[PDB]
Design a protein around this motif. Sequence first.
Motif, PDB file in Angstrom:
ATOM      1  N   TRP A  30      61.944   9.954  22.167  1.00  0.00           N
ATOM      2  CA  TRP A  30      61.139  11.150  22.329  1.00  0.00           C
ATOM      3  C   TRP A  30      59.680  10.848  22.050  1.00  0.00           C
ATOM      4  O   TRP A  30      59.332   9.798  21.512  1.00  0.00           O
ATOM      5  CB  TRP A  30      61.625  12.248  21.398  1.00  0.00           C
ATOM      6  N   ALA A  31      58.817  11.781  22.441  1.00  0.00           N
ATOM      7  CA  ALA A  31      57.389  11.699  22.163  1.00  0.00           C
ATOM      8  C   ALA A  31      56.890  13.081  21.790  1.00  0.00           C
ATOM      9  O   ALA A  31      57.074  14.029  22.554  1.00  0.00           O
ATOM     10  CB  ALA A  31      56.618  11.167  23.367  1.00  0.00           C
ATOM     11  N   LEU A  32      56.235  13.193  20.647  1.00  0.00           N
ATOM     12  CA  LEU A  32      55.827  14.493  20.137  1.00  0.00           C
ATOM     13  C   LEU A  32      54.314  14.597  20.169  1.00  0.00           C
ATOM     14  O   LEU A  32      53.637  13.919  19.385  1.00  0.00           O
ATOM     15  CB  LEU A  32      56.364  14.681  18.718  1.00  0.00           C
ATOM     16  N   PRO A  33      53.743  15.398  21.039  1.00  0.00           N
ATOM     17  CA  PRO A  33      52.284  15.456  21.142  1.00  0.00           C
ATOM     18  C   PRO A  33      51.635  16.284  20.052  1.00  0.00           C
ATOM     19  O   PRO A  33      52.280  16.685  19.085  1.00  0.00           O
ATOM     20  CB  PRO A  33      52.065  16.092  22.514  1.00  0.00           C
ATOM     21  N   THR A  34      50.344  16.526  20.197  1.00  0.00           N
ATOM     22  CA  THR A  34      49.602  17.411  19.313  1.00  0.00           C
ATOM     23  C   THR A  34      49.372  18.707  20.071  1.00  0.00           C
ATOM     24  O   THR A  34      48.597  18.737  21.032  1.00  0.00           O
ATOM     25  CB  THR A  34      48.281  16.781  18.886  1.00  0.00           C
ATOM     26  N   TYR A  35      50.043  19.769  19.643  1.00  0.00           N
ATOM     27  CA  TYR A  35      49.948  21.053  20.312  1.00  0.00           C
ATOM     28  C   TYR A  35      48.888  21.916  19.653  1.00  0.00           C
ATOM     29  O   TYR A  35      48.760  21.929  18.429  1.00  0.00           O
ATOM     30  CB  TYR A  35      51.276  21.793  20.269  1.00  0.00           C
ATOM     31  N   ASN A  36      48.139  22.645  20.473  1.00  0.00           N
ATOM     32  CA  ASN A  36      47.161  23.627  20.016  1.00  0.00           C
ATOM     33  C   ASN A  36      46.076  23.032  19.141  1.00  0.00           C
ATOM     34  O   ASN A  36      45.408  23.765  18.418  1.00  0.00           O
ATOM     35  CB  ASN A  36      47.826  24.768  19.245  1.00  0.00           C
ATOM     36  N   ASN A  37      45.848  21.730  19.208  1.00  0.00           N
ATOM     37  CA  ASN A  37      44.870  21.081  18.345  1.00  0.00           C
ATOM     38  C   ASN A  37      45.095  21.457  16.883  1.00  0.00           C
ATOM     39  O   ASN A  37      44.165  21.811  16.162  1.00  0.00           O
ATOM     40  CB  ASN A  37      43.446  21.428  18.774  1.00  0.00           C
ATOM     41  N   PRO A  63      51.671  24.846  16.090  1.00  0.00           N
ATOM     42  CA  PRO A  63      51.546  23.439  16.478  1.00  0.00           C
ATOM     43  C   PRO A  63      52.838  22.656  16.371  1.00  0.00           C
ATOM     44  O   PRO A  63      52.919  21.555  16.919  1.00  0.00           O
ATOM     45  CB  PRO A  63      50.503  22.909  15.499  1.00  0.00           C
ATOM     46  N   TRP A  64      53.836  23.169  15.673  1.00  0.00           N
ATOM     47  CA  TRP A  64      55.055  22.422  15.427  1.00  0.00           C
ATOM     48  C   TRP A  64      55.886  22.296  16.693  1.00  0.00           C
ATOM     49  O   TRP A  64      55.836  23.146  17.578  1.00  0.00           O
ATOM     50  CB  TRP A  64      55.854  23.128  14.343  1.00  0.00           C
ATOM     51  N   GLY A  65      56.642  21.202  16.785  1.00  0.00           N
ATOM     52  CA  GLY A  65      57.651  21.024  17.802  1.00  0.00           C
ATOM     53  C   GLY A  65      59.048  21.132  17.214  1.00  0.00           C
ATOM     54  O   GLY A  65      59.238  21.234  16.009  1.00  0.00           O
ATOM     55  N   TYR A  66      60.043  21.085  18.093  1.00  0.00           N
ATOM     56  CA  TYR A  66      61.403  21.220  17.599  1.00  0.00           C
ATOM     57  C   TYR A  66      62.390  20.494  18.499  1.00  0.00           C
ATOM     58  O   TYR A  66      62.193  20.389  19.709  1.00  0.00           O
ATOM     59  CB  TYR A  66      61.788  22.687  17.466  1.00  0.00           C
ATOM     60  N   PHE A  67      63.459  20.000  17.886  1.00  0.00           N
ATOM     61  CA  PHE A  67      64.541  19.348  18.602  1.00  0.00           C
ATOM     62  C   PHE A  67      65.573  20.372  19.028  1.00  0.00           C
ATOM     63  O   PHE A  67      66.008  21.192  18.218  1.00  0.00           O
ATOM     64  CB  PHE A  67      65.227  18.301  17.734  1.00  0.00           C
TER      65      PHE A  67
END
Lengths: 104, 104
Positions: A30-37, A63-67
């Motif tokens: 996976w790759a987790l970007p930077t959301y919303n700065n 800004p958080w991501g989730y699986f």
Amino acid sequence: ADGVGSSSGNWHCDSTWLGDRVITTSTRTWALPTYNNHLYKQISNGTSGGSTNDNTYFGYSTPWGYFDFNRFHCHFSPRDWQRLINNNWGFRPKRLNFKLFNIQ
Amino acid sequence: PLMGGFGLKHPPPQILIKNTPVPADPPTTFSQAKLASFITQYSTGQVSVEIEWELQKENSKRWNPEIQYTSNYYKSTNVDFAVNTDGTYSEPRPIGTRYLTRNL
């Protein structure tokens, strides 16, 4: 112990059909970007625009991501699915186990 | 075997059965000839045969689905491998044993 040069885990994808238990393991990259700065943001949609009254909402985008592993084909190969649905009446999950490793 | 099967050196021993002959009334004066007149007779009963089998479970990492033996999904005048109106059992097609795959 662990460090920059030693890997954090091993790849596992497999299915263990044992009696009444089937144990399905899986692994992905996976790759987790930077959301919303790095920002929380209010998001909303009103009926003052082109939107209608049913489509309005109010909420926040973090800004958080989730699986999300919540689909079946994440956990089953079409052949492991065929062994399941052909040979068995019912199935339910018992327990799961989850790992992140090898972080770059 | 060329018909297919399990070639055995000591196969299952063939079982032989006969109605023990019961004579009709012999004459009252002795005769050397064998008794040529018998009682018309037959027997019936129940027979049971129970064979234990040894299976080799299929263990394969093939991704896509196998080919399976499935009955016809579409409607029909009567069920296959089941009696007709008159009580006549029938087997519609020969069914071989090889649907699974291996690597040559």
